[PDB]
Enzyme design. Sequence first.
Site, PDB file in Angstrom:
ATOM      1  N   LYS A 189      19.729  -2.656   3.088  1.00 41.95           N
ATOM      2  CA  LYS A 189      19.830  -4.080   2.791  1.00 41.95           C
ATOM      3  C   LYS A 189      20.581  -4.897   3.833  1.00 41.95           C
ATOM      4  CE  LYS A 189      20.509  -2.253  -1.907  1.00 41.95           C
ATOM      5  NZ  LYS A 189      21.132  -0.984  -1.444  1.00 41.95           N
ATOM      6  N   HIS A 214      20.169  -8.217   0.449  1.00 41.22           N
ATOM      7  CA  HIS A 214      21.163  -7.732  -0.510  1.00 41.22           C
ATOM      8  C   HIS A 214      21.549  -8.693  -1.642  1.00 41.22           C
ATOM      9  CE1 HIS A 214      24.430  -4.371  -0.572  1.00 41.22           C
ATOM     10  NE2 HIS A 214      24.099  -4.735  -1.796  1.00 41.22           N
ATOM     11  N   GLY A 250       0.770  -1.233   0.000  1.00 45.14           N
ATOM     12  CA  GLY A 250       0.000   0.000   0.000  1.00 45.14           C
ATOM     13  C   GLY A 250       0.806   1.290   0.000  1.00 45.14           C
ATOM     14  N   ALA A 251       2.110   1.203   0.251  1.00 46.21           N
ATOM     15  CA  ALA A 251       2.958   2.391   0.272  1.00 46.21           C
ATOM     16  C   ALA A 251       3.341   2.805  -1.140  1.00 46.21           C
ATOM     17  CB  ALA A 251       4.203   2.140   1.099  1.00 46.21           C
ATOM     18  N   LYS A 252       3.703   4.072  -1.295  1.00 43.87           N
ATOM     19  CA  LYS A 252       4.100   4.602  -2.589  1.00 43.87           C
ATOM     20  C   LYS A 252       5.596   4.879  -2.591  1.00 43.87           C
ATOM     21  CE  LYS A 252      -0.524   6.413  -3.123  1.00 43.87           C
ATOM     22  NZ  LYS A 252      -1.405   7.610  -2.998  1.00 43.87           N
ATOM     23  N   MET A 253       6.286   4.260  -3.543  1.00 45.89           N
ATOM     24  CA  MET A 253       7.729   4.378  -3.674  1.00 45.89           C
ATOM     25  C   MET A 253       8.130   5.329  -4.790  1.00 45.89           C
ATOM     26  SD  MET A 253      10.297   1.188  -4.270  1.00 45.89           S
ATOM     27  CE  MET A 253      12.058   1.329  -4.149  1.00 45.89           C
ATOM     28  N   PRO A 254       8.893   6.385  -4.455  1.00 48.98           N
ATOM     29  CA  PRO A 254       9.353   7.373  -5.435  1.00 48.98           C
ATOM     30  C   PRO A 254      10.172   6.701  -6.534  1.00 48.98           C
ATOM     31  CG  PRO A 254       9.532   8.273  -3.263  1.00 48.98           C
ATOM     32  CD  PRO A 254       9.263   6.801  -3.094  1.00 48.98           C
ATOM     33  N   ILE A 255       9.751   6.914  -7.773  1.00 40.60           N
ATOM     34  CA  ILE A 255      10.391   6.328  -8.937  1.00 40.60           C
ATOM     35  C   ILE A 255      11.874   6.694  -9.078  1.00 40.60           C
ATOM     36  CG2 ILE A 255       9.846   8.126 -10.619  1.00 40.60           C
ATOM     37  CD1 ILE A 255       9.076   5.897 -12.562  1.00 40.60           C
ATOM     38  N   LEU A 256      12.261   7.834  -8.513  1.00 35.51           N
ATOM     39  CA  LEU A 256      13.645   8.296  -8.561  1.00 35.51           C
ATOM     40  C   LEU A 256      14.236   8.291  -7.159  1.00 35.51           C
ATOM     41  CD1 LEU A 256      15.983   9.598 -10.194  1.00 35.51           C
ATOM     42  CD2 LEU A 256      14.891  11.806  -9.811  1.00 35.51           C
ATOM     43  N   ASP A 288      18.736   5.200  -1.419  1.00 38.91           N
ATOM     44  CA  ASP A 288      19.085   3.784  -1.368  1.00 38.91           C
ATOM     45  C   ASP A 288      20.339   3.611  -0.521  1.00 38.91           C
ATOM     46  OD1 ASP A 288      20.762   1.319  -3.022  1.00 38.91           O
ATOM     47  OD2 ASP A 288      18.693   0.956  -2.422  1.00 38.91           O
ATOM     48  N   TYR A 313      27.947  -0.571   2.518  1.00 36.24           N
ATOM     49  CA  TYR A 313      28.427   0.668   1.903  1.00 36.24           C
ATOM     50  C   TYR A 313      29.287   1.470   2.879  1.00 36.24           C
ATOM     51  CZ  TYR A 313      25.009  -0.302  -1.829  1.00 36.24           C
ATOM     52  OH  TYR A 313      24.286  -0.903  -2.835  1.00 36.24           O
ATOM     53  N   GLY A 325      21.341   6.837  -5.057  1.00 34.92           N
ATOM     54  CA  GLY A 325      22.158   5.719  -4.615  1.00 34.92           C
ATOM     55  C   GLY A 325      23.342   6.237  -3.816  1.00 34.92           C
TER      56      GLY A 325
HETATM   57  N1  NAP Z   1      21.575  -3.973  -4.677  1.00 28.16           N
HETATM   58  C1  NAP Z   1      22.806  -4.079  -5.158  1.00 28.16           C
HETATM   59  O1  NAP Z   1      23.437  -5.124  -5.155  1.00 28.16           O
HETATM   60  C2  NAP Z   1      23.427  -2.835  -5.762  1.00 28.16           C
HETATM   61  C3  NAP Z   1      24.608  -2.914  -6.497  1.00 28.16           C
HETATM   62  C4  NAP Z   1      25.198  -1.781  -7.047  1.00 28.16           C
HETATM   63  C5  NAP Z   1      24.596  -0.548  -6.847  1.00 28.16           C
HETATM   64  N2  NAP Z   1      23.412  -0.455  -6.103  1.00 28.16           N
HETATM   65  C6  NAP Z   1      22.730   0.828  -5.819  1.00 28.16           C
HETATM   66  O2  NAP Z   1      22.538   1.478  -7.071  1.00 28.16           O
HETATM   67  C7  NAP Z   1      23.114   2.777  -6.962  1.00 28.16           C
HETATM   68  C8  NAP Z   1      23.510   3.263  -8.350  1.00 28.16           C
HETATM   69  O3  NAP Z   1      24.421   2.374  -9.017  1.00 28.16           O
HETATM   70  P1  NAP Z   1      26.014   2.660  -9.105  1.00 28.16           P
HETATM   71  O4  NAP Z   1      26.517   3.388  -7.917  1.00 28.16           O
HETATM   72  O5  NAP Z   1      26.643   1.371  -9.442  1.00 28.16           O
HETATM   73  O6  NAP Z   1      26.276   3.697 -10.336  1.00 28.16           O
HETATM   74  P2  NAP Z   1      25.573   4.667 -11.408  1.00 28.16           P
HETATM   75  O7  NAP Z   1      24.495   5.468 -10.824  1.00 28.16           O
HETATM   76  O8  NAP Z   1      25.312   3.876 -12.617  1.00 28.16           O
HETATM   77  O9  NAP Z   1      26.802   5.637 -11.673  1.00 28.16           O
HETATM   78  C9  NAP Z   1      27.410   6.354 -10.590  1.00 28.16           C
HETATM   79  C10 NAP Z   1      28.552   7.120 -11.235  1.00 28.16           C
HETATM   80  O10 NAP Z   1      28.027   7.894 -12.319  1.00 28.16           O
HETATM   81  C11 NAP Z   1      28.451   9.259 -12.168  1.00 28.16           C
HETATM   82  N3  NAP Z   1      27.335  10.145 -12.568  1.00 28.16           N
HETATM   83  C12 NAP Z   1      26.217  10.433 -11.870  1.00 28.16           C
HETATM   84  N4  NAP Z   1      25.486  11.358 -12.503  1.00 28.16           N
HETATM   85  C13 NAP Z   1      26.181  11.613 -13.607  1.00 28.16           C
HETATM   86  C14 NAP Z   1      25.884  12.591 -14.546  1.00 28.16           C
HETATM   87  N5  NAP Z   1      24.724  13.242 -14.565  1.00 28.16           N
HETATM   88  N6  NAP Z   1      26.790  12.760 -15.534  1.00 28.16           N
HETATM   89  C15 NAP Z   1      27.893  12.013 -15.621  1.00 28.16           C
HETATM   90  N7  NAP Z   1      28.167  11.080 -14.715  1.00 28.16           N
HETATM   91  C16 NAP Z   1      27.334  10.875 -13.681  1.00 28.16           C
HETATM   92  C17 NAP Z   1      28.778   9.450 -10.704  1.00 28.16           C
HETATM   93  O11 NAP Z   1      29.796  10.443 -10.489  1.00 28.16           O
HETATM   94  P3  NAP Z   1      29.752  11.383  -9.195  1.00 28.16           P
HETATM   95  O12 NAP Z   1      29.195  10.570  -8.098  1.00 28.16           O
HETATM   96  O13 NAP Z   1      31.180  11.679  -9.039  1.00 28.16           O
HETATM   97  O14 NAP Z   1      28.906  12.515  -9.638  1.00 28.16           O
HETATM   98  C18 NAP Z   1      29.309   8.087 -10.361  1.00 28.16           C
HETATM   99  O15 NAP Z   1      30.644   8.107 -10.843  1.00 28.16           O
HETATM  100  C19 NAP Z   1      24.261   2.579  -5.997  1.00 28.16           C
HETATM  101  O16 NAP Z   1      24.846   3.772  -5.484  1.00 28.16           O
HETATM  102  C20 NAP Z   1      23.563   1.753  -4.955  1.00 28.16           C
HETATM  103  O17 NAP Z   1      22.717   2.626  -4.221  1.00 28.16           O
HETATM  104  C21 NAP Z   1      22.830  -1.600  -5.571  1.00 28.16           C
HETATM  105  O1  2CL Z   2      26.817  -5.318  -3.631  1.00 33.70           O
HETATM  106  C1  2CL Z   2      26.660  -4.086  -3.766  1.00 33.70           C
HETATM  107  O2  2CL Z   2      25.588  -3.514  -3.510  1.00 33.70           O
HETATM  108  C2  2CL Z   2      27.799  -3.224  -4.267  1.00 33.70           C
HETATM  109  C3  2CL Z   2      29.113  -3.951  -4.378  1.00 33.70           C
HETATM  110  C4  2CL Z   2      29.988  -3.974  -3.293  1.00 33.70           C
HETATM  111 CL1  2CL Z   2      29.495  -3.318  -1.724  1.00 33.70          CL
HETATM  112  C5  2CL Z   2      31.259  -4.517  -3.446  1.00 33.70           C
HETATM  113  C6  2CL Z   2      31.658  -5.032  -4.671  1.00 33.70           C
HETATM  114  C7  2CL Z   2      30.782  -4.998  -5.749  1.00 33.70           C
HETATM  115  C8  2CL Z   2      29.513  -4.460  -5.607  1.00 33.70           C
HETATM  116 CL2  2CL Z   2      28.378  -4.517  -6.962  1.00 33.70          CL
END
Ligand code: NAP
Ligand code: 2CL
EC number: 1.1.1.21
Length: 309
Positions: free
Chosen positions: A76, A109, A8-14, A42, A47, A17
């Site tokens: 996570k 995670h 029932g909750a609403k999650m912001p599309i943007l 997120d 992290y 990270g």
């Molecule tokens: N659940 C999981 O296992 C998992 C795994 C990986 C990631 N995640 C989550 O997903 C989030 C996003 O993924 P991600 O961190 O891998 O990377 P991403 O969002 O694909 O890219 C982050 C990088 O892109 C750069 N960037 C951001 N905006 C930009 C722009 N407008 N123009 C040019 N470059 C830009 C950032 O630079 P600056 O920061 O220097 O601006 C940073 O270097 C993570 O932070 C985390 O919250 C979850």
């Molecule tokens: O697992 C994550 O969310 C991010 C992550 C970590 Cl913490 C360390 C190595 C690779 C990656 Cl993709």
Amino acid sequence: SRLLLNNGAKMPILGLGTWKSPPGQVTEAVKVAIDVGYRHIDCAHVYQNENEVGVAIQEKLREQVVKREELFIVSKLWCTYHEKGLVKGACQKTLSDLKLDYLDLYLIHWPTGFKPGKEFFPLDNVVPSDTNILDTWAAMEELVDEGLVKAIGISNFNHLQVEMILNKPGLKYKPAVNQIECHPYLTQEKLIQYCQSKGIVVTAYSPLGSPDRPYAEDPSLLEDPRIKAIAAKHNKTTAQVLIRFPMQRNLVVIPKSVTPERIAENFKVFDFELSSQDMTTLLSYNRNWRVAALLSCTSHKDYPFHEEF
Ligand SMILES: NC(=O)c1ccc[n+]([C@@H]2O[C@H](COP(=O)([O-])OP(=O)(O)OC[C@H]3O[C@@H](n4cnc5c(N)ncnc54)[C@H](OP(=O)(O)O)[C@@H]3O)[C@@H](O)[C@H]2O)c1
Ligand SMILES: O=C(O)Cc1c(Cl)cccc1Cl
């Protein structure tokens, strides 16, 4: 601008990270994000920056820029806390660092459980736990009954692992979200089609291809000429196109950034629309390339990437 979750909750599309965001830069990053308009952050224990993320949140709540109910905080459960007795403990550590009394969404995670300890990635490559996905899910369900989290979900789970939870005897809470890697080079059409048909919201991580990933000849999304052309036609940047891409696929997107101007730029993705042609073209760029393939857990009993989807 928000998707309805099965609770029932609403999650912001943007969302913003925080992986790779330095402790000395994420507080200011989250503060700016909240002022710009972000209401979804997120997070994750692994992290190593939730305490600092929490500082930004408290300041904004104090400033009354936002009310707690307006924010959607996500975190996570790390792999070393899959045991039944370690789950509540891990969730509480996170709640303390973030300085909150409840989380909007708590995700498992990765499906792989590691040997419990101080090391995030225990080694002998990677010592596993004998725990399974169903026992860990039951522990996650208790967090909802105790009021620590509003909803529970999964991350990096393949369709068979998602199915295992859905067919669990005595299933009390269905997974609200499955966060997976998704961008033009890893479209995930099958897993997204699967999850969406089961009422599970999909969150796309590494939307820009994670250009700052620790493991650094590799393909760059932000520098792809084909994607730069689509951006020019709409007068937007390639990042805004890459962020708008999953939004039109009805996915929640969480681009990471610690730069004020980029954080603001990444927010200006509601005033334009990619044509159906632009979408089909972006989908054709699929190469099945993963930024996060958990190379060290290749032989783990629960490695998620052996199946097609
Ligand atoms: N659940 C999981 O296992 C998992 C795994 C990986 C990631 N995640 C989550 O997903 C989030 C996003 O993924 P991600 O961190 O891998 O990377 P991403 O969002 O694909 O890219 C982050 C990088 O892109 C750069 N960037 C951001 N905006 C930009 C722009 N407008 N123009 C040019 N470059 C830009 C950032 O630079 P600056 O920061 O220097 O601006 C940073 O270097 C993570 O932070 C985390 O919250 C979850
Ligand atoms: O697992 C994550 O969310 C991010 C992550 C970590 Cl913490 C360390 C190595 C690779 C990656 Cl993709």
